[PDB]
C-alpha cells in the first residue's frame, strides 16, 4: 500500500436497512390463515395504507383486529411487532395536582402581595439585631396570579441562526470544561504520586487515601477518570486506586497525560469547523424582519390563504349578524388606488419578467402582455395611449379587440367583475404588489434626504456601483428590482444595498422577483382555462357598455355562473371610477349577486326579476 495515496470511501449504509429475512416467513402463515384472496387483498390494502402514513397505529391494529383477532398467538405476535402496547386502562381517575395553591389565600393588598397567616411558625434567624429585625419584614409575600394579561400580543421567537450560534457556544463550553477538569485532576494526582515515589517499600504497601483526596469538590476526579476509561470499567479502577494508591496511580496518571494532549488537539481540529461555520451564520442573524417575512410570505401568498382571509371576514360578519347588534354587512375587502403611475411601474417589471423567461413561446408572450395591458387599461379606466407613452418614454430615458387578444342603470360610475378563483387570485396579486410599492414610495422624498444627509463601512457597494446617489430613490428601487429580475444582481447584494442605503424599512421588497413570478404564470393560466375566457368575455361585454338595467345585471351573473360549476364559488369585484375604490364581496351561489337593499322596494324589484325567469 506504499505507492498509492488514501481515499475516503463513499459511506457505510446504516444497519436498519439490511436486516429483514427472518420475519418474511410469518406473512405466509398469515396468508394461509386468512385463506381467501379478497380479504387478504384488503388486508394488504390497509397495510400499504399505513406504510404511506395515512392512518394511525392503534387504528391499524383495530383494522387487523377485524381480520386476525380470530387467532390469539398471531395477534399477539403482530401486536408486539408494531409495538402496540396494551392500553390496559378503563379504570383511570384523573387525579388532582399536588401544588398550585393548596394553602395560601388571605387578606391581599395590591395586585401581587398577600399577608402571611398569623401563626407561630416562627423560624428564628441568627444574625439579626434590632435594625435588621425592623427594616427586613416577613408579613407579606408575593405570589404570581397571571391575571389575564388584560391585553394581547404575540411572543418573540428565535431566528433560525441564533439557535445555531447558541448550540456552538454550548459545544465549545463543554469541550473547555472537560479539558480544564482533566488538567486539575492531573495536578492532584501528580502531588500524590510525588508523595508516593520517595518512600520505603513497606510504607507503600499499607498506604490508603480517603475519598476526596483533598479536593473540596472531589467528584470531578472520579468523573474525569470515568470518562477516560468508561462507565463500565471505570468504577473498578476508581476503587483499585482507592485501595492500592502505590502501584495503580502511576498508570492512571500516565493516561490522563495522553488524554489531555489528545483532547486539546481535538478541540483545535474542530475549532476549524466552528470558525468556518460562524462567518456565514452571524451576520444573517441580525436581520430578523427580512428573514421572518421572507418565509412568512413565501408560504402565505398562496391560493388557500387569501380565500381563507376573505371568508373569515365573511363568517364573522354573518355571525355578528346573527347577533342583533349590527344590521348587516355590505362588502368584505376594500382597496384604494390613489397613485396610478405605479400601474405602469408594475408593467416596468411585469413583462420585464417575460423578456427573460424561457417557459413560454414569444407569440403567447405577446398575447399575455396584451392581456395585462388591455386588462389594466379597461378595468382601471386609464387610456391605453397613456400606457403606450409611458412604455415609450420609459425605454427613452432608460435608453385591437381583446377577445382575440385572448383568442335602469344610467350614469354608469360603478362596474362589477363577477369572477371565479383564478381571476381573484391574479387580481389580488396585482393589488398586493401595488400597495407595497405605493407604501415604499410615499416616503421616498425623505429617503433621498436620508441618503444625502448621510455624509462620510461596506466598501463593496462602492466598487460594485450599488450605492445610492442623491438620485430619485424610488426610481432607483425600480431600477434595482429590474436588475435582479433580469439577473443583473444576485440576491444578497440587492439585500444589503437596500438595507443600509434606504433603511431596514424596505424588507417588503426583498422578494419582489418571486411575487412577479406569481402574476406571469396566473395570467398565462387565465388564457388557458377556457371558462375564465368566457368570464372575461362576458365582463368586457358588460363593461364596454355605458347603460343597462339591473335585470341584465342578474342576467350577467346568471350566465357567468353558467361557466363555473355548483361547487365553485364567486367573488364580485366592484370598482367605482371616481375614487378608484375597489371593493370585493364573497358571494354564495343562490343568494343575491349585488349590493344589499337600501330600501325594500328595490328588492321588491329584485324579487319579481329573480323569480320571473
Amino acid at each position: 500500500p506504499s505507492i498509492v495515496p488514501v481515499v475516503p470511501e463513499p459511506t457505510e449504509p446504516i444497519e436498519n436497512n439490511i436486516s429483514l429475512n427472518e420475519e418474511v416467513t410469518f406473512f405466509e402463515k398469515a396468508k394461509r390463515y386468512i385463506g381467501n384472496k379478497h380479504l387478504y387483498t384488503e388486508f394488504l390494502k390497509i397495510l400499504n395504507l399505513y406504510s404511506q402514513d395515512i392512518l394511525d397505529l392503534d387504528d391499524l391494529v383495530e383494522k387487523v383486529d377485524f381480520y386476525l383477532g380470530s387467532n390469539k398467538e398471531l395477534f399477539t405476535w403482530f401486536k408486539n411487532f408494531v409495538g402496540y402496547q396494551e392500553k390496559t386502562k378503563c379504570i383511570e381517575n384523573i387525579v388532582h395536582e399536588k401544588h398550585r395553591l393548596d394553602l395560601d389565600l388571605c387578606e391581599a393588598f395590591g395586585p401581587s402581595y398577600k399577608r402571611l397567616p398569623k401563626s407561630d411558625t416562627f423560624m428564628p434567624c441568627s444574625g439579626r439585631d434590632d435594625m435588621c429585625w425592623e427594616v427586613l419584614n416577613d408579613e407579606w409575600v408575593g405570589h404570581p396570579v397571571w391575571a389575564s394579561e388584560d391585553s394581547g400580543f404575540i411572543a418573540h421567537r428565535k431566528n433560525q441562526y441564533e439557535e445555531t450560534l447558541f448550540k456552538i457556544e454550548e459545544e465549545r463550553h463543554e469541550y473547555d470544561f472537560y479539558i480544564e477538569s482533566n488538567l486539575r485532576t492531573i495536578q492532584c494526582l501528580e502531588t500524590i504520586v510525588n508523595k508516593i515515589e520517595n518512600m520505603t517499600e513497606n510504607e507503600k504497601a499499607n498506604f490508603k487515601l480517603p475519598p476526596g483526596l483533598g479536593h473540596t469538590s472531589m467528584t470531578i476526579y472520579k468523573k474525569v477518570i470515568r470518562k477516560v476509561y468508561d462507565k463500565e470499567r471505570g468504577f473498578e479502577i476508581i476503587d483499585a486506586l482507592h485501595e492500592h494508591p502505590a502501584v495503580t496511580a502511576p498508570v492512571v496518571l500516565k493516561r490522563l497525560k495522553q488524554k489531555d494532549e489528545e483532547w486539546r488537539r481535538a478541540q483545535r481540529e474542530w475549532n476549524k469547523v466552528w470558525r468556518e461555520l460562524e462567518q456565514k451564520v452571524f451576520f444573517k442573524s441580525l436581520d430578523h424582519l427580512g428573514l421572518t417575512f421572507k418565509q412568512a410570505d413565501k408560504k402565505l401568498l398562496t391560493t388557500k390563504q387569501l380565500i381563507s382571509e376573505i371568508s373569515s371576514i365573511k363568517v364573522d360578519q354573518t355571525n355578528k349578524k346573527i347577533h342583533w347588534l349590527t344590521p348587516k354587512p355590505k362588502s368584505q375587502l376594500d382597496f384604494d388606488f390613489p397613485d396610478k403611475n405605479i400601474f405602469y411601474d408594475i408593467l416596468c417589471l411585469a413583462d420585464t419578467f417575460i423578456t427573460h423567461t424561457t417557459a413560454y413561446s414569444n407569440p403567447d408572450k405577446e398575447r399575455l402582455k396584451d392581456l395585462l395591458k388591455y386588462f389594466i387599461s379597461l378595468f382601471f379606466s386609464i387610456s391605453f395611449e397613456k400606457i403606450e407613452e409611458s412604455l415609450y418614454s420609459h425605454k427613452q430615458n432608460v435608453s385591437m379587440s381583446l377577445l382575440d387578444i385572448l383568442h335602469i342603470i344610467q350614469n354608469r360610475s360603478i362596474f362589477n367583475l363577477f369572477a371565479n378563483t383564478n381571476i381573484y387570485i391574479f387580481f389580488r396579486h396585482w393589488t398586493t404588489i401595488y400597495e407595497r410599492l405605493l407604501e415604499i414610495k410615499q416616503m421616498n422624498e425623505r429617503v433621498t434626504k436620508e441618503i444625502n444627509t448621510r455624509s462620510t463601512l461596506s466598501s463593496q457597494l462602492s466598487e460594485m456601483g450599488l450605492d445610492f446617489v442623491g438620485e430619485d430613490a424610488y426610481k432607483q428601487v425600480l431600477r434595482l428590482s429590474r436588475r435582479l429580475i433580469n439577473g443583473d444582481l444576485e440576491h444578497q447584494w440587492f439585500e444589503e444595498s437596500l438595507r443600509q442605503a434606504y433603511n431596514n424599512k424596505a424588507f417588503k421588497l426583498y422578494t419582489i422577483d418571486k411575487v412577479t413570478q406569481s402574476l406571469v404564470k396566473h395570467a398565462h393560466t387565465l388564457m388557458t382555462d377556457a371558462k375564465t375566457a368566457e368570464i372575461m368575455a362576458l365582463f368586457v361585454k358588460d363593461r364596454n357598455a355605458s347603460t343597462t338595467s339591473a335585470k341584465d345585471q342578474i342576467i350577467y351573473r346568471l350566465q357567468v355562473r353558467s361557466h363555473m360549476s355548483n361547487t365553485e364559488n364567486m367573488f364580485r369585484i366592484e370598482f367605482d371610477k371616481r375614487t378608484l375604490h375597489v371593493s370585493i364581496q364573497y358571494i354564495a351561489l343562490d343568494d343575491l349577486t349585488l349590493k344589499e337593499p337600501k330600501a325594500d322596494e328595490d328588492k321588491w324589484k329584485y324579487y319579481v326579476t329573480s323569480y320571473a325567469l
Binding site: 402581595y113 423560624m123 444574625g127 427594616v135 436581520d287 430578523h288
Partner: protein
C-alpha cells in the same frame, strides 16, 4: 411626559473621578451548575481576562474578599436553609427528598459539586465591597460574582440560592440613612423587593419586562405596603425596546427619584440578559445603550455598588462588563480585542461590540407616556430623606 430623543454617544465626565475597588476570586470559575444548564460562572472568569489585557488594573485595586460565614448568611436567610445548603450534595440527594421540596432545591436550581463555595464567594465579595464603601476607602465597589436577586428568605428561585444583595444593602444601611436599588435586569427583582417591601430606608426601582414572563411579579401598582408605600417602583416594558427608547424611559425616572427621594447610596444590578442576542431575554439594547445607564448613575456622585447578575450568552456579557469597567475609571476602551486566551469565543470579527438586530419594537409612545406620568403621579410623597 415621555419625549423621544436620539442616542448621542458615550462621554466620560472628567469633572468626577473615583477610586474603584474590584473584587474577584480565581476559583469561582471552576463550579459548573451542570451540563446544559444556562447559568455559567465561566462568564465572570471571561470578563476578568479582558480586564487583565486592557491594563485596567493600573487604575483600580483588585481584592479578594473573605468568603462570608454562616452567621452573616443568617442575617437574611433562615438557619434551616443554610444548614441544608451546607449539607446537601449530589452524592446524598435522596436522603433529603423531604426538605429538598420545601426549599425548591432540585427542580430548576440543581445541586452541583461545591455550590456552597460559590454562594460564600458571592456573599463575601458583596459584603466586603459594602463594608469598604462605608469606611471611606473607595467610591465604587465592583463585584461581578454577586447579583443573585431571585433568592428568597427561605427558598431558592432562578438559580439564586443566596441573596447577597440584601446582605450588602443591610450593610450599607448601618452607615447611610437611605439607599436606592436599581435593577436593569430583564427579569423582575423579586427577591430584593420582597425583602425590603414595607420599609422606607430602601427604595427599589426595577426595569423589567412584564406579561407572561418569569417570575410573574412586578406590576405597575405594586408600590409596597404600609410604611414603604410609594417606596417601590416597577417599570414594565415590552419586547424589542432599544437604546433611544430605553434611555428616554430610564434617565427621567432615575433623575426624578434622585431629586425627590434623596438617596445616600445606590446599588446597580447590571444583568446582561437585556442585551441583543441573549438566550433567555427579548430586549434589544446594545453595548453602549447598556453602559449608558451605569454612566448616568455614576454622574450623580454618591457611593455606588455595581453587582453582576443574569446574562446567558457568555461573550456578550463579558464584553459589556469589561466596557463598563473601563468607563468606571473615566476611560473609553479601544474597540479591538487584545489576544487573551478566550479569544476564539469572540468570532468572527473579534471586536468590542454588541450589535442590535432589526427586531420589531412594541413600546409605543402612548404606553410609555401613561406609565411614566402615573409613576411621577404616585412619586409625590417621596420627598423627605
Amino acid at each position: 411626559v415621555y419625549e423621544a430623543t436620539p442616542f448621542d454617544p458615550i462621554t466620560v465626565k472628567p469633572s468626577d473621578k473615583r477610586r474603584v475597588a474590584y473584587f474577584y476570586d480565581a476559583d469561582v470559575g471552576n463550579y459548573a451548575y451542570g451540563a446544559g444548564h444556562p447559568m455559567k460562572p465561566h462568564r465572570i472568569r471571561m470578563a476578568h481576562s479582558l480586564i487583565m489585557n486592557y491594563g485596567l488594573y493600573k487604575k483600580m485595586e483588585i481584592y479578594r474578599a473573605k468568603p462570608a460565614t454562616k452567621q452573616e448568611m443568617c442575617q437574611f436567610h433562615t438557619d434551616e436553609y443554610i444548614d441544608f445548603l451546607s449539607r446537601v450534595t449530589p452524592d446524598n440527594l435522596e436522603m433529603f427528598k423531604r426538605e429538598s421540596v420545601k426549599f425548591n432545591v432540585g427542580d430548576d436550581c440543581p445541586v452541583f459539586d461545591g455550590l456552597y463555595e460559590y454562594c460564600s464567594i458571592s456573599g463575601g465579595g458583596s459584603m466586603e465591597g459594602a463594608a469598604r464603601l462605608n469606611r471611606g476607602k473607595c467610591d465604587v465597589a465592583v463585584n461581578y460574582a454577586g447579583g443573585l436577586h431571585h433568592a428568597k428568605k427561605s427558598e431558592a428561585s432562578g438559580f439564586c440560592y443566596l441573596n447577597d444583595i440584601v446582605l450588602g444593602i443591610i450593610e450599607l444601611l448601618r452607615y447611610h440613612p437611605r439607599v436606592l436599588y436599581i435593577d436593569i435586569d430583564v427579569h423582575h427583582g423579586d427577591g430584593v423587593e420582597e425583602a425590603f417591601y414595607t420599609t422606607d430606608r430602601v427604595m427599589t426601582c426595577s426595569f423589567h419586562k412584564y406579561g407572561e414572563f418569569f417570575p410573574g411579579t412586578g406590576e405597575l401598582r405594586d408600590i409596597g405596603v404600609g410604611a414603604g408605600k410609594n417606596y417601590a417602583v416597577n417599570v414594565p416594558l415590552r419586547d424589542g425596546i432599544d437604546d433611544a427608547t430605553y434611555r428616554s424611559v430610564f434617565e427621567p425616572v432615575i433623575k426624578k427619584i434622585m431629586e425627590w427621594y434623596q438617596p445616600s447610596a445606590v446599588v446597580l444590578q447590571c444583568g446582561g440578559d437585556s442585551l441583543s442576542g441573549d438566550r433567555l431575554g427579548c430586549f434589544n439594547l446594545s453595548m453602549e445603550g447598556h453602559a449608558n445607564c451605569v454612566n448616568y448613575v455614576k454622574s450623580f456622585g454618591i457611593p455606588m455598588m455595581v453587582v453582576g447578575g443574569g446574562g446567558y450568552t457568555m461573550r456578550n456579557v463579558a464584553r459589556t462588563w469589561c466596557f463598563e469597567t473601563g468607563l468606571l475609571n473615566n476611560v473609553v476602551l479601544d474597540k479591538d480585542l487584545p489576544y487573551n486566551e478566550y479569544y476564539e469565543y469572540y468570532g468572527p470579527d473579534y471586536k468590542l461590540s454588541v450589535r442590535p438586530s432589526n427586531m420589531f419594537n412594541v413600546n409605543t409612545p402612548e404606553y410609555l407616556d401613561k406609565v411614566m406620568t402615573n409613576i411621577f403621579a404616585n412619586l409625590e410623597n417621596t420627598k423627605y430623606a
